[PDB]
Design an enzyme around this catalytic site. Structure first.
Site, PDB file in Angstrom:
ATOM      1  N   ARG A  47       0.867  -1.187   0.000  1.00  0.00           N
ATOM      2  CA  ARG A  47       0.000   0.000   0.000  1.00  0.00           C
ATOM      3  C   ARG A  47       0.899   1.230   0.000  1.00  0.00           C
ATOM      4  NH1 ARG A  47      -4.858   1.888   0.622  1.00  0.00           N
ATOM      5  NH2 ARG A  47      -5.600   3.593   1.950  1.00  0.00           N
ATOM      6  N   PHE A  83       2.012  10.731   1.398  1.00  0.00           N
ATOM      7  CA  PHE A  83       1.475  10.234   2.652  1.00  0.00           C
ATOM      8  C   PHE A  83       2.411   9.202   3.271  1.00  0.00           C
ATOM      9  CE2 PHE A  83      -2.316   7.839   4.871  1.00  0.00           C
ATOM     10  CZ  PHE A  83      -1.792   8.180   6.111  1.00  0.00           C
ATOM     11  N   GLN A  89       3.653   1.447   2.903  1.00  0.00           N
ATOM     12  CA  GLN A  89       3.311   0.467   3.929  1.00  0.00           C
ATOM     13  C   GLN A  89       3.694  -0.954   3.503  1.00  0.00           C
ATOM     14  OE1 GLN A  89      -0.573   1.037   5.570  1.00  0.00           O
ATOM     15  NE2 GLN A  89      -0.842  -1.112   6.248  1.00  0.00           N
ATOM     16  N   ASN A 108      -2.210  -0.268  11.992  1.00  0.00           N
ATOM     17  CA  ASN A 108      -3.217  -0.922  12.817  1.00  0.00           C
ATOM     18  C   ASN A 108      -4.625  -0.675  12.295  1.00  0.00           C
ATOM     19  OD1 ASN A 108      -4.377   1.490  14.240  1.00  0.00           O
ATOM     20  ND2 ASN A 108      -2.360   1.590  15.195  1.00  0.00           N
ATOM     21  N   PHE A 141       4.637   1.154   8.536  1.00  0.00           N
ATOM     22  CA  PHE A 141       4.760   2.111   7.426  1.00  0.00           C
ATOM     23  C   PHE A 141       5.822   3.155   7.704  1.00  0.00           C
ATOM     24  CE2 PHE A 141       1.292   3.553  10.130  1.00  0.00           C
ATOM     25  CZ  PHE A 141       1.434   4.945  10.215  1.00  0.00           C
ATOM     26  N   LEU A 167      -1.750  11.368  13.248  1.00  0.00           N
ATOM     27  CA  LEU A 167      -1.485   9.990  13.622  1.00  0.00           C
ATOM     28  C   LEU A 167      -0.895   9.862  15.037  1.00  0.00           C
ATOM     29  CD1 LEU A 167      -0.104   8.359  10.336  1.00  0.00           C
ATOM     30  CD2 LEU A 167      -2.480   8.450  11.149  1.00  0.00           C
ATOM     31  N   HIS A 175      -0.954   5.689  16.202  1.00  0.00           N
ATOM     32  CA  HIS A 175      -0.002   4.651  15.755  1.00  0.00           C
ATOM     33  C   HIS A 175       1.287   4.721  16.548  1.00  0.00           C
ATOM     34  CE1 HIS A 175      -2.304   3.643  12.035  1.00  0.00           C
ATOM     35  NE2 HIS A 175      -2.773   4.853  12.281  1.00  0.00           N
TER      36      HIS A 175
END
Length: 155
Positions: free
Chosen positions: A45, A50, A53, A92, A103, A112, A116
């Protein structure tokens, strides 16, 4: 474990680990790395501006398990945050659902913070992360060509 090198098909990403603070998260990561658990994992991903991952051996996006089998807890610390790009964090699906997936951010991601676990930061090879995030992806954000982790060395 103080640091790691993630060898990928696009080059090498060197990471310092927050071993003092995130003891369990660093342990999960380092044990998996050394056992070869992350080898042949793709970056499944990737979202430009951004994050990228990885950490799912199935490549599906939902796969991977912690070294305990069961998912484990978040480890949040004020001084460990996403104010800078190129932070290394656990993926998660809500509170206390840490598995093996992780990531690397390419932009500040303060939204975040305290969602995370931040467990490392890139110290060399941020350009590699920037290369990874520019690749052509499908509608599910999976790169058209697989980008693979070859090895992870733990120092």
């Amino acid at each position: 474990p103080k640091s790691a090198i993630i060898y990928t098909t696009m080059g090498d990403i060197h990471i310092s680990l927050f071993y003092k603070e995130c003891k369990k998260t660093v342990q999960n990561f380092s044990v998996h790395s050394i056992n070869g658990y992350y080898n042949n994992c793709i970056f499944h991903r990737v979202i430009k501006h951004f994050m990228v991952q990885t950490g799912d051996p199935s490549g599906d996006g939902t796969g991977g398990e912690s070294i305990w089998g069961n998912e484990f807890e978040d480890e949040f610390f004020d001084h460990l945050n996403h104010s800078k790009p190129f932070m290394v964090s656990m993926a998660n699906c809500g509170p206390n659902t840490n598995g093996s997936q992780f990531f690397i951010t390419t932009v500040p991601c303060p939204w975040l913070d305290f969602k995370h676990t931040v467990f490392g930061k890139v110290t060399q090879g941020s350009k590699i992360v920037l290369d990874i995030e520019k690749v052509r992806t499908d509608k599910r954000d999976k790169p058209l060509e697989d980008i693979k982790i070859l090895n992870i060395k733990i120092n």
